[PDB]
Amino acid sequence: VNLRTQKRLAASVLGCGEGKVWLDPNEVSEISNANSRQSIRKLVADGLIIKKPVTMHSRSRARELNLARRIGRHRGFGKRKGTADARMPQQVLWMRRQRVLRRLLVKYRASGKIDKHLYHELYHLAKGNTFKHKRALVEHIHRAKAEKARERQIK
């Protein structure tokens, strides 16, 4: 008894690969009598032909390793293989920092904490790499405000 045609037809009917087709070994003559797709569908409905489930590929180890790397494990010099720039680019870091500083300056000018001339010179200082982060820019704005208030109180 040859069942190659039946295996191919059952794969096409079940919508799977031929390695996922299960033909009942105790029903080989009745499966061999099935030459048409209607007969294969009838055997599938009878349960003589079933589609085997997929083989396991779990992501549990990947998720635990992701949580460990999030909390800081496996980040040492023995784990690093690419260069520092290949791992995190300085251009990406700079672009993020510039966008953060420009967003903060636009917010402060819109709210009215700083005026337009102060905004302009702070924009050019941020482009000239004076402030390394948002807290640095905020503290610079505060010290400039303190100097301006002291000058106004003196005058």
Residues that bind another protein (CB under 8 A): 22, 47, 50, 52-56
Beta-sheet strands, E only, within 42-146: 49-51
Amino acid identity, residue 124?
H
Applying CB under 7 A, the span of 4-12, 33-41, 48-56, 64-72 interacting with RNA comes to 64-72
Of 46 and 64, which CB lies nearer to another protein in the complex structure?
Answer: 46
Of 37 and 74, which CB lies nearer to RNA in the complex structure?
Answer: 74
Q: Does 100 bind RNA (CB under 7 A)?
A: yes
**How far apart are alpha carbons 140 and 45 in whole angstroms?**
76
With beta carbons less than 8 A apart as the criterion, state whether 18 and 49 touch.
Answer: no
- Among 42, 63, 66, 150, which residue interacts with RNA (rule: CB under 7 A)? 66
The tokens of 41 are what? Answer: 């569908």
The tokens of 100 are what? Answer: 């953060």
**How far apart are alpha carbons 114 and 153 in whole angstroms?**
18
Residues that bind RNA (CB under 7 A): 66, 68-85, 87-88, 90-91, 94-97, 100, 103-104, 113, 124-125, 127-130, 133-135, 138, 142, 145-146
